[PDB]
Design an enzyme around this catalytic site. Sequence first.
Site, PDB file in Angstrom:
ATOM      1  N   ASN A   1       2.240  -4.231   7.500  1.00 21.21           N
ATOM      2  CA  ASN A   1       2.604  -3.179   6.569  1.00 21.21           C
ATOM      3  C   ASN A   1       4.084  -3.305   6.216  1.00 21.21           C
ATOM      4  O   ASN A   1       4.943  -3.224   7.099  1.00 21.21           O
ATOM      5  CB  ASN A   1       2.309  -1.808   7.160  1.00 21.21           C
ATOM      6  CG  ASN A   1       2.058  -0.769   6.097  1.00 21.21           C
ATOM      7  OD1 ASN A   1       1.204  -0.961   5.242  1.00 21.21           O
ATOM      8  ND2 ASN A   1       2.771   0.351   6.165  1.00 21.21           N
TER       9      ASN A   1
ATOM     10  N   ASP B   1       3.860   4.088   6.043  1.00 21.17           N
ATOM     11  CA  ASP B   1       3.877   4.615   4.676  1.00 21.17           C
ATOM     12  C   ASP B   1       4.402   6.047   4.702  1.00 21.17           C
ATOM     13  O   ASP B   1       4.985   6.528   3.722  1.00 21.17           O
ATOM     14  CB  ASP B   1       2.472   4.548   4.023  1.00 21.17           C
ATOM     15  CG  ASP B   1       2.021   3.103   3.702  1.00 21.17           C
ATOM     16  OD1 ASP B   1       0.793   2.895   3.530  1.00 21.17           O
ATOM     17  OD2 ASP B   1       2.873   2.177   3.612  1.00 21.17           O
TER      18      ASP B   1
ATOM     19  N   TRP C   1      -3.859  -4.095  11.471  1.00 25.03           N
ATOM     20  CA  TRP C   1      -2.997  -3.581  10.414  1.00 25.03           C
ATOM     21  C   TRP C   1      -1.736  -3.076  11.100  1.00 25.03           C
ATOM     22  O   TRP C   1      -1.711  -1.964  11.609  1.00 25.03           O
ATOM     23  CB  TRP C   1      -3.714  -2.464   9.629  1.00 25.03           C
ATOM     24  CG  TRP C   1      -2.872  -1.767   8.557  1.00 25.03           C
ATOM     25  CD1 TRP C   1      -1.835  -2.294   7.821  1.00 25.03           C
ATOM     26  CD2 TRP C   1      -3.040  -0.418   8.094  1.00 25.03           C
ATOM     27  NE1 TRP C   1      -1.341  -1.338   6.937  1.00 25.03           N
ATOM     28  CE2 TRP C   1      -2.062  -0.185   7.088  1.00 25.03           C
ATOM     29  CE3 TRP C   1      -3.905   0.633   8.453  1.00 25.03           C
ATOM     30  CZ2 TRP C   1      -1.928   1.057   6.445  1.00 25.03           C
ATOM     31  CZ3 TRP C   1      -3.775   1.875   7.803  1.00 25.03           C
ATOM     32  CH2 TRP C   1      -2.790   2.074   6.817  1.00 25.03           C
ATOM     33  N   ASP C   2      -0.685  -3.896  11.129  1.00 24.16           N
ATOM     34  CA  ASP C   2       0.438  -3.567  12.013  1.00 24.16           C
ATOM     35  C   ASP C   2       1.482  -2.715  11.284  1.00 24.16           C
ATOM     36  O   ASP C   2       2.053  -3.172  10.297  1.00 24.16           O
ATOM     37  CB  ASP C   2       1.105  -4.842  12.542  1.00 24.16           C
ATOM     38  CG  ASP C   2       1.875  -4.576  13.822  1.00 24.16           C
ATOM     39  OD1 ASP C   2       2.095  -3.364  14.156  1.00 24.16           O
ATOM     40  OD2 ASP C   2       2.195  -5.557  14.511  1.00 24.16           O
ATOM     41  N   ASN C   3       1.703  -1.490  11.744  1.00 21.63           N
ATOM     42  CA  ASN C   3       2.758  -0.626  11.155  1.00 21.63           C
ATOM     43  C   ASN C   3       4.103  -0.704  11.919  1.00 21.63           C
ATOM     44  O   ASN C   3       4.964   0.148  11.739  1.00 21.63           O
ATOM     45  CB  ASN C   3       2.292   0.843  11.100  1.00 21.63           C
ATOM     46  CG  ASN C   3       1.107   1.062  10.142  1.00 21.63           C
ATOM     47  OD1 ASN C   3       1.148   0.644   9.014  1.00 21.63           O
ATOM     48  ND2 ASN C   3       0.067   1.770  10.612  1.00 21.63           N
TER      49      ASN C   3
ATOM     50  N   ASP D   1      -9.309   6.219   4.859  1.00 23.87           N
ATOM     51  CA  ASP D   1      -8.357   6.865   5.751  1.00 23.87           C
ATOM     52  C   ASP D   1      -8.024   8.338   5.434  1.00 23.87           C
ATOM     53  O   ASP D   1      -7.392   9.003   6.246  1.00 23.87           O
ATOM     54  CB  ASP D   1      -7.082   6.018   5.906  1.00 23.87           C
ATOM     55  CG  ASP D   1      -6.401   5.714   4.571  1.00 23.87           C
ATOM     56  OD1 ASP D   1      -5.179   5.930   4.470  1.00 23.87           O
ATOM     57  OD2 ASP D   1      -7.072   5.256   3.618  1.00 23.87           O
ATOM     58  N   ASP D   2      -8.456   8.861   4.290  1.00 26.58           N
ATOM     59  CA  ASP D   2      -8.237  10.296   4.033  1.00 26.58           C
ATOM     60  C   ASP D   2      -9.479  11.040   3.506  1.00 26.58           C
ATOM     61  O   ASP D   2      -9.780  11.024   2.303  1.00 26.58           O
ATOM     62  CB  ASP D   2      -7.005  10.511   3.140  1.00 26.58           C
ATOM     63  CG  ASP D   2      -6.502  11.957   3.159  1.00 26.58           C
ATOM     64  OD1 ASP D   2      -5.274  12.149   3.291  1.00 26.58           O
ATOM     65  OD2 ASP D   2      -7.320  12.895   3.029  1.00 26.58           O
TER      66      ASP D   2
ATOM     67  N   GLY E   1       0.781  -1.248   0.000  1.00 27.07           N
ATOM     68  CA  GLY E   1       0.000   0.000   0.000  1.00 27.07           C
ATOM     69  C   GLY E   1       0.814   1.301   0.000  1.00 27.07           C
ATOM     70  O   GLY E   1       0.257   2.382   0.230  1.00 27.07           O
TER      71      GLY E   1
ATOM     72  N   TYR F   1      -8.304   4.998  12.663  1.00 29.96           N
ATOM     73  CA  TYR F   1      -7.812   3.606  12.648  1.00 29.96           C
ATOM     74  C   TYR F   1      -6.814   3.276  13.751  1.00 29.96           C
ATOM     75  O   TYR F   1      -6.169   2.211  13.726  1.00 29.96           O
ATOM     76  CB  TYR F   1      -7.246   3.223  11.269  1.00 29.96           C
ATOM     77  CG  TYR F   1      -6.120   4.137  10.769  1.00 29.96           C
ATOM     78  CD1 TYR F   1      -4.801   3.943  11.198  1.00 29.96           C
ATOM     79  CD2 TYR F   1      -6.382   5.187   9.877  1.00 29.96           C
ATOM     80  CE1 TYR F   1      -3.769   4.769  10.768  1.00 29.96           C
ATOM     81  CE2 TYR F   1      -5.353   6.014   9.412  1.00 29.96           C
ATOM     82  CZ  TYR F   1      -4.039   5.784   9.866  1.00 29.96           C
ATOM     83  OH  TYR F   1      -3.002   6.591   9.442  1.00 29.96           O
TER      84      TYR F   1
END
Lengths: 443, 443
Positions: B254, B226, B219-221, B115-116, B8, B160
């Site tokens: 991610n 990003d 959703w693990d960052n 998300d935006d 992504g 999120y």
Amino acid sequence: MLTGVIEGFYGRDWRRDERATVMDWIAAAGMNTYIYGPKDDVHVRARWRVPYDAAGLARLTELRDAAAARGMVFYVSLAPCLDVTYSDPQDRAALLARVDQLARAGLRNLVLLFDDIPSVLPEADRHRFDSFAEAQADLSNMVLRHLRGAGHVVFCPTEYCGRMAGGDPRGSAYLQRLGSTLDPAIDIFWTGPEIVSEEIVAAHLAAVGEVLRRRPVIWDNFHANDYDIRRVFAGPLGGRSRDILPLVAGWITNPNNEAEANFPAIHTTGAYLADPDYAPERAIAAAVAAWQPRFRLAFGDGAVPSDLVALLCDLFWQPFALGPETTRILSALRAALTVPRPDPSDPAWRAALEDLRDLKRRINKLFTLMTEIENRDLFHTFHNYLWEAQEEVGHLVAYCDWLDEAPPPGAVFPATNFYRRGFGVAVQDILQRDRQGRYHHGV
Amino acid sequence: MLTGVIEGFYGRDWRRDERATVMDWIAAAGMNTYIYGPKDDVHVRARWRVPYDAAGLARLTELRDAAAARGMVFYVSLAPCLDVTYSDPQDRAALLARVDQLARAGLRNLVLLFDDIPSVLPEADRHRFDSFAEAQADLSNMVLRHLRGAGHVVFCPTEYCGRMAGGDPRGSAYLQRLGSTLDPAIDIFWTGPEIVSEEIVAAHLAAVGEVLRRRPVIWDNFHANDYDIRRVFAGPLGGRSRDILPLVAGWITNPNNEAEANFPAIHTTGAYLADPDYAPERAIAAAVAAWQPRFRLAFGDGAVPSDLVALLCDLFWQPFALGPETTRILSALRAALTVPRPDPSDPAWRAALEDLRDLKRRINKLFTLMTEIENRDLFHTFHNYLWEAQEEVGHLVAYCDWLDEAPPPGAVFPATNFYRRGFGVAVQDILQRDRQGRYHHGV
Ligand SMILES: [Cl-]
Ligand SMILES: [Cl-]
């Protein structure tokens, strides 16, 4: 340069498959020599005057051919030292007949061992030879001259380390006479300042070379000593700088009598001999990666995980050092046990205790997994050492768990060569027991 | 359970061979999902109303087939959030046409991203929908109902993570309305209390499940965000206990936009999901052993040694921690730098300094070897990080070498989110620079 392994220990000799395995390891480590001399073989030493029968000789020729196919030279040992009359025509003849039997069979590479002699020279020798040194050298020169330029001789001296030689090896009358009498083409074994040397240094080997009048072949007992069967060392070769290699004529590793123990000894010794940048902790990491397949679990594709093979090495590291990981864990514990009653809320005590509990968990896992591996001899090699490691860390965690519950000052824990180190010794070092039977940590 | 990777990120999307490589890694880690949504693809988000041309669609079908052959389900992303009128027949139709094009091609697994969004709802929507939550849910339910029981939908919410939701997620009006309006068959992404969460804990996920009225897909960052392209994390997944797994419906990693960075992220995340006894340091050891073949040196059979691959991970470990080996080396240095002028003969200073010099040697070796590897993309991934690591340890050794020569007290060294950590930051932490330009160590 002569490099490799000597099969010279007491107990069961190696099986054919074991000898093949170890030879593969020697070849892969870039080494080039296998020396055969097991205590099991009555012909080598106990009844050295007796030649091999037809079958024994054939077993030796097949070993030679097996080493040759791998790029290794095969040596046979003879130890005619316990009851020899050096001047006696019959004993001289008996030794030459041994040599001749081997030489005619094409076994021309010999080790002559003189490490166990009587206190006094036989009076049949005393008028003709002035010393043991002169006598042993004459007998060994005779062997060399018999081989007529095809073959090589390595000599194990009666005094083979600095302590036996009296400290400074140049001070020894025996070594002085040996160096000037023994033919220059004959190599001489040397173990360092001690039988099991913590360090072998350049200055020391310069002195040895002076008195021997030649660079010695190192016989390294770092990983194993034929007379200490209660120990296992799976860590890297240490205490020898690369800067000593121009001062030696060879490097012969004394193996553990358990074949499977020897993988890291041989792998790291190979790295030491080949790599200018040898560093023991980097070398042991390389050895762990190459060793791990031998840890395949019975009935499956998986193996003992790399981290736990590395722990095996760390626990059973070197004769004069615990491995670095377990050393740091135990040292952080000592530093938090500067007080009689550690404060359970103290961050330093808390960190030290969690790393100890974690060490117990990993030892327990390693122990259990080892019982489940396909290679049963590898399991047998380490089982009793891991058993004792498990019991010891068990006792120490039990002790520290009790201190963590904050007992009153007066309460007591409810029951149920000084350079040398080990996990067991280090644990007792911390957790002592006074004259009344009470455990404590040296307040 | 839905587990795997989301492509992504911004920058270049992955090449076909890169996507294959990463899919192999996902499959080997025991995970089962690949989500496609690169910023490179103008159709996903920037011009979301525009359907794919014939060739683009075919590229997606081939990716699906490629993931399927490996045991993975393939998802396609749609992000109709920047300029959507949720009630508009034309925009509703445009979204349904996107969905229909994918569904007819057999791409029935979709991620809808919100998300935006604009600050305020469009007034065309405001009488019909009471909120963004209600609007986004209606539009997403529409997508679900269009798929007629074949296909699955995952929803990325506008809020999120816990900070966006206002702290306690049960306190959010948006999440409250979302949980009660969004069809229960639609999954919902969640990153934890923060975008990049140091820890994700059970109590927190229990609260999330309450308000979402369903367990979230994580959703693990942890390894990549990003919007932070200056960082690389090659250490193990940490800060998430196994005890949270009954509280989640999935785990989507991610990835770093550099494909080759992701090997340990994926390997250790796989271990976390599969093994009750997951322990980050043991998992990273397993990952280093499996990763090492990728470090084959150009024109030879050899590879970067295991110990140095392990060091790569230790240096570039986690967002909130330096690796354990380098942490201990720097901490022992701090503890010997409690005085303005360390005593050069002091054993503690001497030990700390030798381990620092040794760390510099090993970084230098790793850096040089990396320039020589066959896989040039792996080299490019780590080069600038290793360059900076080398310069930083260079400066610190130079500083400590100067202190070791025992300068006078007054002399100065001649020149030439707070949980977050790294090698560079830790070094400057120790070696500071005052308002006059002078380096010191905080006396
Ligand atoms: Cl492993
Ligand atoms: Cl290696």
